[PDB]
Symmetry: C3
């Protein structure tokens, strides 16, 4: 009877592109590109994110009346703003180096708001009750920022501030303040009793001077004067000193801080849920061990690299043809293996996988698709970055970097899978052919090969025929004597 050699063919319609041939089907494949994400904003790197809801960083750090919460976590791995974040610097004016504060805050390994200049009698001879405005209203009354105190004359005088703090808390200490630019001299003289108003701030690493710019301006939130917000980072043991003979919005809470390398902001409405995470996108978290993703180019954490492609499928299985031997096609009559034998005997009709060869193959195939993933060298990054009104050369430079790595990675990846699919899908045919040859190493003359990729054995035998194949032991010349007439 015959002995036939070929491969498991399977009901699925999984398809892989190969550089030689588009749109071909393979019996099993490993998808490397994540098209699906978990739809949530999630706990990352052991800690929850800071979620700011209706209010942005320029309102949270100022403590806008319309935003009130504990720090989402005394340690957090990113900042999230909702897609609506209209609340902010509700009293208008530019937050200076605001895109830099937004970087340093993005991750902190501790944070504690602490009242370094406490509202209780740190400010004798001055107001700290009635510095309030309609621009940031609550209860329909005048109200104000909670983290900063807007000082005003008491009575008919403004004693110059001389406040000092010495950083004894053994930490980086973030400090902030504001400066007020009244719209008119009449407003300046009424609140601050001084046209010569100025501020000075002193530090070791830093020192700067500020002055008012009294001039009428277009209405925003119907406010006509405007407020400049500034910030500073005093190192351990350093000292910070304020002086003012006028305009100030002095700190009342400073903030204790420490910072790791960090990772930036995300802006979206997705809700927050407990599950742990390593990789993040604006749309939703990902849990993965794959090299490439296409769901969004912005990322936090151990990013998989973004690509514009859609079907990065590596083959693992064979060319799927159910359409005799491999030259006609495979067998769906075979299961739980790859390459194998159909054989006949007195009981016969056996379809069985060759486990030693299949196991040898899948050892190397597992290492192959694994080498594509294990050698990726992913490392902690935050891909989206923030640039203001007049940084457009650098903003476009960023964009050139971002699309350069995109263009490289799609061309690398799409040619990569094409070359390794071209390899593997002939790797199978070469392993099958080599297994056929390995049967020729017994059946050198004593069987009729047929162009289907199969044998006719020249004389009758029991299952001891397949015993001779599986253990390669064949004792050829006796069996030619039974074959004799059928060869003749």
């Amino acid at each position: 009877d015959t002995l036939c050699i070929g491969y498991h063919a399977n009901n699925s319609t999984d398809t892989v592109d190969t550089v030689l041939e588009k749109n071909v089907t393979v019996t099993h494949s490993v998808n490397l590109l994540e098209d699906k994400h978990n739809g949530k904003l999630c706990k990352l790197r052991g800690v929850a994110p800071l979620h700011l809801g209706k209010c942005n960083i320029a309102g949270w750090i100022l403590g806008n009346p319309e935003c009130e919460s504990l720090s989402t976590a005394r340690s957090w791995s990113y900042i999230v703003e909702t897609s609506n974040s209209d609340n902010g610097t509700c009293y208008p004016g530019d937050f200076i180096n605001y895109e830099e504060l937004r970087e340093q805050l993005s991750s902190v390994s501790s944070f504690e708001r602490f009242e370094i200049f406490p509202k209780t009698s740190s400010w004798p001879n001055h107001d700290s009750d009635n510095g309030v405005t309609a621009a940031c209203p609550h209860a329909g009354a005048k109200s104000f920022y909670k983290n900063l105190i807007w000082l005003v004359k008491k009575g008919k005088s403004y004693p110059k501030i001389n406040q000092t703090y010495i950083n004894d808390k053994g930490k980086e200490v973030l400090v902030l303040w504001g400066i007020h630019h009244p719209p008119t001299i009449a407003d300046q003289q009424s609140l601050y009793q001084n046209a010569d108003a100025y501020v000075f701030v002193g530090t070791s690493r830093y020192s700067k001077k500020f002055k008012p710019e009294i001039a009428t301006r277009p209405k925003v939130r119907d406010r006509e004067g405007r407020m400049n917000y500034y910030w500073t980072l005093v190192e351990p043991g350093d000292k910070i000193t304020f002086e003012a003979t006028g305009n100030l919005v002095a700190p009342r809470y400073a903030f204790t801080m420490e910072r790791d390398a960090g990772s930036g902001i995300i802006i979206s409405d997705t809700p927050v849920h407990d599950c742990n995470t390593t990789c993040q996108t604006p749309e939703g978290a990902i849990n993965t061990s794959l090299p490439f993703q296409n769901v969004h180019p912005i990322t936090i954490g151990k990013c998989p690299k973004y690509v514009k492609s859609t079907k990065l499928r590596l083959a693992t299985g064979l060319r799927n043809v159910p359409s005799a031997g491999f030259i006609e096609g495979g067998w769906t009559g075979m299961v739980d293996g790859w390459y194998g034998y159909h054989h006949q005997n007195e009981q016969g009709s056996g379809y069985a996988a060759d486990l030693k060869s299949t196991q040898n193959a899948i050892d190397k195939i597992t290492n192959k698709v694994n080498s594509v993933i294990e050698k990726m060298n992913t490392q902690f990054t935050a891909v989206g970055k923030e640039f203001n009104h007049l940084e457009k050369r650098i903003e476009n430079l960023n964009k050139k970097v971002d699309d350069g790595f995109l263009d490289i990675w799609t061309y690398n990846a799409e040619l990569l899978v094409l070359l390794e699919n071209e390899r593997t899908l002939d790797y199978h045919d070469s392993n099958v052919k080599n297994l056929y040859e390995k049967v020729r190493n017994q059946l050198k003359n004593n069987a009729k090969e047929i162009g289907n990729g199969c044998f006719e054995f020249y004389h009758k035998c029991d299952n001891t025929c397949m015993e001779s194949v599986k253990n390669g032991t064949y004792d050829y010349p006796k069996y030619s004597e039974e074959a004799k007439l059928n060869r003749e």
Copy 2:
């Protein structure tokens, strides 16, 4: 007679490098690297470029007397300056954020100069005729910028400007102005009657203050005082307000604008011609569907990627050896095909390509070289960028990005073509070998193979021999009986 198998060899001397063997010749090749360009500056993306001729952007936007033209197009896809562009800010002084204006202007989807502060009586009690000087001369008379008005006292007083505009035109509105720094107090008091001179500008997104710096300076164009040029975008519905109690060079034309993503400047003398374009270089336009180019690293549009290489040629044809079968060499006696048969019969001497195999091959070869081009993912960019006197850390950072992508792309590309040439130039030999084997699938025993890669058939036959090969139908055992004595 013999049947011989091999391949078309050709009179051309086209060469391809392969990682195993340098400088080898192949019968046909696809050049992927453009060494040639069309030598023109051209219509791009459906719109003509702005060509500024003898005058640079800092003179065009100011409207230098020595530059006069309509906007080259009411919509343009890039700005061109000629390699000589000496005219510009002919009254000296720094154009502030000038490299940012040069970016935002680089492309516009509409632009219209419109006289938002018209020269007719917008300036009562003030001069607007005699603000002219020799530094930007015409007819040998004093002259001045056309788009800006240099105001001066009328009589013996300078009433404070209070000009306002409200953006009702439903567009981004670009506005510009100048500020004058007289060289001495005597010049300041004579023109502006005020030592306390200052300017304020107010907006929602912006506000700033400016003051004179009265001090003598080294002569340039023999002007000793100097002029600072500033600019602003007012958003739809926003308001802009000027105040001045002195030095101003107030706007008279503002400009309506809208901007797409855009693409930057080119600087060269090449003339302008009508034909449409997608890809640009400083030397000359390109029309292409190739992935790599080496003519210039600066680019606009859907750039092909730059490389330092010179001979990115993919093979498509075979190893060209005219120097019997393929082991001796190919046949120049064969045409309009690749792999093929020489056969003999009573009429005989046939050299003919095997069209089904050749067509099967060229199907896959076309898809191969096409996959290298189609998967490139080119996208709209402008590679050259501009950095001033004191931005050199960023200028070098740009240069590190530019040469990084260069170093990657040449090493990728040159190894890429080497690997795929190494593949294809054995791909041919394996296809030819497999075609020989496919003849062995008839001629298993009934022909003498010879070490040239050819057959002697053991008995005489008509063209029905080639009929048996072309249709694989051979009826072997009868034909052994005529072969009998010649095998014996």
Copy 3:
């Protein structure tokens, strides 16, 4: 007797990874990754480095008292600061654009300190002896910077400086100056006799104004006023002008300069030695012709590209198995070659390499591993770059570029060597097989092949057997008559 075919196997345990099989041994290999460096800071590009020892650039250019040397070379290819560099701007205050000056200085093709405003009577009516301070002491006395002169009133007046220089030396001329900010009005009035103190500086390409910021500050080096340091390049034929009615620290030495493209700073303690160099790292110099290095990511010169990998070894030799023919294993009984023949004759026992085939192989293998190196396109760069307190968006952008090229290069390199090891280690088996087939082209029927990968020859012969193989001339049918009975 027998003719046996296989390959040299060798005592070494050099190992290569292949995508199909980890940790396999190969007889010989070319390491592409420099694990080792020469431990020195070295002469580069034909010129010495500048080595600044105990003092940093912000003290050298000022000429701190504790820093005294010639320029280490009148031309230098990089600046080196020792890992201790605590001396610097020993009178405190920000060196303005200091990270930019640190770039332009990094390499100079000439530099000469020259006393453009010589201490001899360029400063009538003013002090230049007693402008000294305890903040930069020597001998326990007051002392001061050497390259700058701190002017002070003489008597009870301060005549306005009006110094001028015209760049007649035909070079770029670097100029520097300081500005002093006394801590109190009392200190200002006592030293400079004027409250209105200001400085102006004039140039063609540049002009600016400066003023004092008199306010108390936290002690550093127990100094309470602070000093701002500024700089300028005047172009050939250009003029520079100083004016002051007060605070100045005027130049006394300017510096003649010219600059190439340049390459940045290194900071380390490694000692300086004479040997010439092209490639550099902070730890120690390198001399190399390899593409990849992992010893440090910061570099100068013609950098090899950094990777995080550890064992980029290309194969050159074969699969090493000493464990009959190649199917059992190789021979350590063979030397000075690769593929070869064992043969027998009346004297016999010959093990000899096939020199024409081995030479043919090593021609192509040498070109292979060479093509991986020769095409690298290395070009002169300086990878580490410097960003200050408030440039963290750009500092992180740099970091995204740096780890992008890292991530690309490890993934490219590790998959690159895996693919070419997978290629070569079957390239050998295919060349050996083809050499076996090339013996079949004589021994078509006239020898018994055995599954070890070897021949038994059917009749007795002298060394003329190996003569027939080496020269492919075999006269088959005349010899068959001795083989007759042994084939029967």
